[PDB]
Design a protein around this nucleic acid. Structure first.
Lengths: 49, 71
DNA sequence: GCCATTTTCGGCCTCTGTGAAAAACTCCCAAAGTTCCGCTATCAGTTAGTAAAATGATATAAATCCAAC
DNA sequence: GTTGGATTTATATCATTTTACTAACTGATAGCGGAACTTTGGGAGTAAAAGAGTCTCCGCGAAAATGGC
């Protein structure tokens, strides 16, 4: 999502920067979004909507 | 706080499965059961107990305390 | 040194809303715009699989300790 | 006083559950490029002869800096 960087990236570029493939990166992102969808770490960001 | 789903606890899936083994549905149910009672459980071992008690201490309510007229 | 024509100024706040004339067509050609379809890239959604790590359960070995003789 | 079985701790190995990393299918969706078609946009041309501008306005005064003689 291009935060604190000069450009945005697809999962190919993130896969190449690490030693990791398409589906792996896709499901690390999925895991991150489930982690942040938890109510414990989301009350602060709710007020931003 | 004692009226929230155990889901809203951020615990490892092993611990969640183990808690569903004893049909613990909401929090507070978890706190009226001591450590020796809990540990006598399939797959709910040492490290899971330390994780659950550390998250409980983050909630601040470690295992054991009693209350009135629940519910 | 003296007319004689230009140039330059003329208090602070507050509200306020403007549409109001004016008369050609015609033909040819090129480029932009609109729309449709096909290929390609990119991602969510889901399932199943395999190796490995993590964790718990059980096993195997002693410490010692406590009761009975 | 004691001592040996047993009733607990101590250390290690095994099984179960989960994690980390693959691929394949599914379904869509957006973006780009080309071909055709319709719209827009620029240019050239017109053969009774037609052959000198507005422009209403123009209810200002005192002083000073400028040419012209």
């Amino acid at each position: 999502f291009g935060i604190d960087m000069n450009t945005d990236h697809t999962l190919e570029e993130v896969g190449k920067q690490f030693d990791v493939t398409r589906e792996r990166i896709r499901q690390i992102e999925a895991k991150a979004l489930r982690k942040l969808r938890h109510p414990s770490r989301s009350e602060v960001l709710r007020s931003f909507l | 706080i004692l009226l929230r789903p155990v889901d809203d606890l951020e615990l490892t899936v092993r611990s969640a499965n183990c808690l569903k083994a004893e049909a613990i549905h909401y929090i507070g149910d978890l706190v009226q059961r001591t450590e020796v009672e809990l540990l006598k459980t399939p797959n709910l071992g040492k490290k899971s107990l330390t994780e659950i008690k550390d998250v409980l201490a983050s909630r601040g309510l470690s295992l054991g305390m009693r209350l009135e007229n629940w519910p």
